[PDB]
From a paper:
The NiV RNA genome is encapsidated by the nucleoprotein (N), forming a long helical nucleocapsid assembly. This assembly not only safeguards the viral genome from degradation, but also serves as a template for productive transcription of mRNA and replication of the nascent viral RNA genome by the viral RNA dependent RNA polymerase (RdRp). Each N protein monomer is comprised of two main globular N-terminal and C-terminal Ncore (Nucleocapsid core) domains, with each domain flanked by the N-terminal arm (NT-arm, residues 1–31) and the C-terminal arm (CT-arm, residues 373–398) subdomains. The structure shows that the nucleic acid lies within the charged cleft of the N protein at the interface between the N-terminal Ncore and the C-terminal Ncore domains.
A spiral assembly of the full length NiV nucleocapsid protein, bound to E. coli cellular RNA, was purified from recombinant expression in E. coli, and its structure was determined by CryoEM single-particle 3D reconstruction. Reconstruction of the spiral assembly (65% of the particles) with a mask corresponding to a 13-subunit spiral turn and imposing local symmetry, resulted in a 3.5 Å resolution CryoEM map. The final model shows that 13 nucleocapsid monomers bind to the single-stranded RNA forming a left-handed spiral turn with outer and inner diameters of 204 and 56 Å, respectively. Assuming the NiV nucleocapsid forms a continuous spiral with the same symmetry, the pitch for NiV nucleocapsid is calculated to be 54 Å with 13.4 subunits per turn. The spiral assembly of the NiV nucleocapsid is primarily formed through lateral contacts over a calculated interface area of ~3000 Å2 between two adjacent protomers. The contact area includes a hydrophobic core comprising an aromatic residue (F11) from one protomer and a triad of aromatic residues (F267, F268, Y301) in the adjacent protomer. The NT and CT arms, which have been reported to play a role in the spiral assembly of nucleocapsid, occupy a hydrophobic groove in the C-terminal Ncore domain of the adjacent protomer. The RNA molecule is bound to the protein in the classical “3-base-in, 3-base-out” conformation, where the RNA chain twists about 180° every 3 nucleotides to place three consecutive nucleotides with the bases facing the protein, followed by 3 nucleotides with exposed bases. Within the RNA binding cleft, a series of basic (K178, R192, R193, R352) and polar (T181, Q319, S344) residues, with well-defined density, are within hydrogen-bonding distance from the RNA sugar-phosphate backbone. At the interface between the two protomers, aromatic residues Y258 and Y354, one from each adjacent protomer, are positioned in close proximity to the RNA chain, facilitating the twist in its conformation.
Numbering used by the authors:
A (entry chain C): 4 to 397
B (entry chain D), C (entry chain E): 4 to 398
Amino acid sequence: IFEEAASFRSYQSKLGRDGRASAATATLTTKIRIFVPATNSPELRWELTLFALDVIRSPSAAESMKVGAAFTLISMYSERPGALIRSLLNDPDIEAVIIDVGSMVNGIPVMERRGDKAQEEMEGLMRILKTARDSSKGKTPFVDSRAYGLRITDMSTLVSAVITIEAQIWILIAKAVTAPDTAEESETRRWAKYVQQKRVNPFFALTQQWLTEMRNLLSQSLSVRKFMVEILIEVKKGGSAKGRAVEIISDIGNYVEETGMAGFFATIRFGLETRYPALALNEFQSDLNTIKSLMLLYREIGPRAPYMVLLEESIQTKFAPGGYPLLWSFAMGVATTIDRSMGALNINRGYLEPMYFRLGQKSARHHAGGIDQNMANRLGLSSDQVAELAAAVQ
Amino acid sequence: IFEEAASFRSYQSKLGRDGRASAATATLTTKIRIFVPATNSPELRWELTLFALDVIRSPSAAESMKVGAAFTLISMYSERPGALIRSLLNDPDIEAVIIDVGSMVNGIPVMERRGDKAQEEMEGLMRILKTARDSSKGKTPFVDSRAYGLRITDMSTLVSAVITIEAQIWILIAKAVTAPDTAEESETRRWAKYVQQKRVNPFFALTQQWLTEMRNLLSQSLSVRKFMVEILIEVKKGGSAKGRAVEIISDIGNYVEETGMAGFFATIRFGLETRYPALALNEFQSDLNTIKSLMLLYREIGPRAPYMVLLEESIQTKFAPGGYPLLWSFAMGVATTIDRSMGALNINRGYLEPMYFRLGQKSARHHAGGIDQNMANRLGLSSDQVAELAAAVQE
Amino acid sequence: IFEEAASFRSYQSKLGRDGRASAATATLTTKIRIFVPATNSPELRWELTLFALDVIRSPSAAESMKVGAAFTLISMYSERPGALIRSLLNDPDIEAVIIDVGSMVNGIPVMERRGDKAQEEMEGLMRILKTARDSSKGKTPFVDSRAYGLRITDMSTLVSAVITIEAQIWILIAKAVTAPDTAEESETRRWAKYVQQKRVNPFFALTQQWLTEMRNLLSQSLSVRKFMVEILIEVKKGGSAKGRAVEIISDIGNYVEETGMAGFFATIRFGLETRYPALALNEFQSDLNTIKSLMLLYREIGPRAPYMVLLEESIQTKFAPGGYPLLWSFAMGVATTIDRSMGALNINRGYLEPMYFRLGQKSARHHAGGIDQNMANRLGLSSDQVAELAAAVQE
RNA sequence: UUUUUUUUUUUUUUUUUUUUUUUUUUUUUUUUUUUUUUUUUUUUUUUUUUUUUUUUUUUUUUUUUUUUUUUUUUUUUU
């Protein structure tokens, strides 16, 4: 009867998603140069970090080389970052040319391995680096200029630096796609955390200007977000040995997961699992069947599922609350009454049903925390006790 | 209808945890020197402990020296201190170099077997130890300076001494990463117990100056907390008799467990297992579902679970009460009302949701301990007795 | 919901607590000499006991000597005292070397089987036993000096003597680690019995000065308490005929069991098995779950459980009433109101929770002398008569 | 056998939150003690065959009455 319809909803949501796309769909690659350190000499690693910071500080650089810089800038972690790149790159938009900087002989720019083939590229980079200084009005990437000056001999001091700047990139990714500005509040809150717990050395704190230039690069290159989410899934995998370096990335991950999918998970939290009497309304049944199909769909996607928005994967559309707007309007009605932080999520969408939102508000507030409507009999609480709870709840 | 939601919560929590993370993630190892007692000689072991105390007392020693000094200083228990470190190291931050010191030939500075590579390491150690003495204005690590000169010749007094300095490190770890100041109250209260029980010899008590220099090394190095929690799990394990040495560590452990997860367990104690009538309120169902997922998650993590804050594991975030703030605010509302130990824990966090906290307080205070709502009927207590309890509780 | 939380409490309690600790944890042994009788000669055995009493009486003897002397002393019961020590010693703190002394010809010091190997040991012993005598203002260990004077040549008087002295050690162990001073009342009781019941010859009573020197040795050595509790568990096992000696010990052991865990058992004995109306309150639920977990934990620990304070096993901490203070404060409020022997136990802990203690009084006294309910309808007599009895009893 | 109708048209990105912070050894009591053989009754005994009455007898066909018989189209108003 209805079972056919429910199975048909399921059918639509999985239809044609099976199998493999034709190689005729293969997109034009773009060629990007990544200067990998490829050495354990701490001097070259820190100089390359400064070079890379400056590439992103520069308004005269192209996006193609800025992405390449972000690929050198994160990934200072491993003994062989060329393995990290080649194994986790996984992007058809990109062909990355990896250059070992080797001895890093050149003073402020990277040394070219084919020094002779073009001097103009070394000039281009030097112009970019000068532009980085001059356009930033002499202000270093760091809030203390001495951090720009000092060059590092000792591996403890190197990693203290590197992990602190990496962490400063990774705090960005959490909101770079989903609220590309206005997220300095959240990012400084997370910064406060990592320095309080002494994981990062705040001598290497980066200026809001540099962080914004990098956050913008992240908002507008998918290629670098793809690499970030690749490595973030990689280190999320359990039971491994962890160094402090990957641990802080993983930690950051917990802010990066479910990003840009607020609507979806908020209908599960403050719609489904809150389980007010309103879930018996006939109107919602289509929406409930939708969310069932979405949860199974989420499961079908597997490990990439919590990051779909950063990856800009198409399937997100299905996830959007336009697919279940009665239940979503209701759920936000609950969310905004229950959770003070849900008050501050923007719910200006065209498909807001204000009567169902007000029913959401009424289910939490007007029903007195739903206190009359105890969900389960395990407490075996007195009727009197429930009434007292409702009185205390105002 | 609802089952799919809870099973999806499960899914989210277990997603991508599976499998083993690629070697391409492997971090730059730093070099740590650990000086090790080669032999059961009391003269060696006590001088080396004094040296090691002085390395952490030093303003001029490098963190790479200091953490390896702290490793030797808390390996002094073992019949084979080199084996203890190398077997429980388990740290990709670190490459350890051991210097099994054969005969302590240099005297005040530690020896090195083939010499320092250009003599400079011995000179480095000497500078370290001088600067320790000079910066400390002559004052020893110990509260009685006679301990510093003592140059022990018998194993009985050595183990008395060692165990007492070790205990003094281990009293720190309980707060070193969770409130590294305000710690002195706890650390002295624990000190009181071990001396009252005559387990440690108070002749060897260490100065607040030295203890804070070591507490800071613990706060700022994960590599030493990794070693500590490795050995703390190791000795917590059953099915052997114990030497007083590992027993005292195990004893300390009971203060180190649950550290830095106050909020989590407090929601279990004073939200969940107290089973107030307030758990019928619809909103808390989301949070209850979360804590169920967290309990099963805790189980899934296994032996490291009680120490996840000291070992700085990402999963901790999951556990933070920001993840279930309605239940947490209510549970702290109960906790602070019921337990006169509570409320000395800081609950100034953004997600306090104080209507639910006040409902917590109004359960335990206003509902007279929730007096009416008896959970189980095996006593079948009279209404008059419940009223007497309401009177005596002072609401 | 709640079932998972209760299982989680259990999980926390048992998490780790399996497998084997790695031998990399293995503690430094301390090497100790135990002199033992080789043979069934009373002339040896009594003089060796006098020597051992004097070693413990000495101001100049080392702790390593003293513990070894306490081993010499308590092993006299058996036909193979070497076998008794070696087989029931179970301790990594220590490394026991046994000397089967042979004929005690070399004066007041014990015999050396291969002569003096340092050519100093006998002189060490001479100094020890001289300083024992001299430090004492000319006293003997015994209240009558003739006991010190009289050599023994028959087994019957030997065993009369030995048992009397061994008993005097064993009466101590019941409060050597808990309340190690103010023990004396419960060492003069405990000497009432035995003398009255004619199990000991009070000719061999020991002076308070010797008993406190031995009590101190017991408080401040774990290794001796470990040996005592090993043999105390050994003799507690049934299914065998016994000698007089072991019976006196076993009888003692009924004093030694549950020592130092007053608070734990008192929460079960008072409060919990009293099943007051107050136990139905929401407040206790955490604590009740705790006690349940502890009872099954007690079961899991098995034979050593009643002695975990004297063995100072880490787990003890778990048991401490800080782990369930609301239930405990109430339980002590019951216990002190009901039992005339309670209250003379010191309950000045920090986690006193006095509103619950006052409710513990107000149940067992204020609620009609603990007659505001009757727990179950075991016979179904009339309420009024029982209430009249409670009024006449006046709480 | 036959005789309708049967294209389409909306909506469908995102935006919050998320490290910590207290407690947490121990303390009391804990042998015993009284009673604890027996003692009386304890066969029997009365009464218990039978006896009266106990066929039958009245009445008991029938008889009156019992076809039918009148009435029975209409008419005002709107």
